[PDB]
Design a protein around this nucleic acid. Sequence first.
DNA 1: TAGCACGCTGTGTATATAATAGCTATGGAACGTTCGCCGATGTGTGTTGTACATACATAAAAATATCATAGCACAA
Length: 408
Amino acid sequence: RPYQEKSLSKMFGNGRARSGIIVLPCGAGKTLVGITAACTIKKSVIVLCTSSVSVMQWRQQFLXXXXXXXXXXXXXXXXXXXXXXXXXXLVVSTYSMVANXXXXXXXXXXXXXXXXXXXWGFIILDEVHVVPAAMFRRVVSTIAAHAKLGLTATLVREDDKIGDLNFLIGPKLYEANWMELSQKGHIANVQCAEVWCPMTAEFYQEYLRETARKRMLLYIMNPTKFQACQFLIQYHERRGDKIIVFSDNVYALQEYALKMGKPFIYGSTPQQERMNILQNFQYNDQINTIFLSKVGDTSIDLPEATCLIQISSHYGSRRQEAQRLGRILRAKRRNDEGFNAFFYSLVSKDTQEMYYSTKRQAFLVDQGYAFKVITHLHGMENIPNLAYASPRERRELLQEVLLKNEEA
DNA sequence: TAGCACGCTGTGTATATAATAGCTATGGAACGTTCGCCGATGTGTGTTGTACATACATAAAAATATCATAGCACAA
């Protein structure tokens, strides 16, 4: 990819003594850039990752290059260990395993052999936006190499600590514009859209009488959000496109999941059921609407479903939802003549959550994506299958929300 | 006059020779029937001691957000 050689030209310029951060999309090949840099340096390279799936991907890249089984390419994890050799090495480690404090499973010595014997020379950190934390400062404080590299896709955080990475690892060298990359490769056009649904009177006065995170249980459970949600679901099913529903709250995800009758993936869920739901979403055309929480978004991103719906949201964590949204957008690439990606933000008027979703839309403006407002698409008035459209169901839902407030 | 005893009559017995008719024991082959003592040495289990792989509540980490309290500032 041209931008990858545009990033490698900086390494080809000076050669020795360099450190910086390279911003590349998730769908791009930053791991290939790490492989090329590993071929240019030829030394013990350590790749800092947070999940085993990324370790398996880096191992697949090592297989795409050459060798992995002979005593040279090592693997560090809490399950097994593998030997290494000087002058050339490729190993992937976990942040929580290298960090620690005093808990030990007779494996911290195996890491202190890679760090004690001084077999290093190249540092690779996956997702640098997570570095602003004490454990990563300890990791950097326990390592020292000749060349450092930071592979990440985003860096927008409101912790005011992203600027420290300019001296902890190095200043950002190349930031690729996702619009020009969309022109190089169709990574699904980004259509940002907020749905403005009216707010009922009872949920408005009860919403004002509530506060903190409890008023979210009155912002999400609005009947017009159920009507507009069903209208968007039936609309996308009529267009023949799969639907992914995001929710920062597990309770709302279970409510919409059970009322819509679709599979759901949330916390404390068996992994076999998660894999079954994933296979049903990949193969079965009857399941075109999935309800995914943060566990289903951080662990895996699927290239299907051009329809992304956002209902639940948390205060301040708008940039993280923009990063996950960006992961689902960049995950969809196949060079199509159309390829229209639709992001909907179900927001209710006069609520305290839309005013942060606007900050998320500001983050979506900083990336160059297109944003437009949507009050209501004509067609919901012709859907007799809408729930909570009658005053009876609205009063019953009001009583259910009041009971939910009495439980919390 | 009938059993008993005596004399008389018929039969089997052994033998060569042939005629030349049916009659039959024999060995083989095939189908249907009830039935099937103390000492020394050596094995033989079963609950269970030992043991391994996956589940699951814990520990912890890590990542973060929001009310309360002290101090400083402002008002009835």
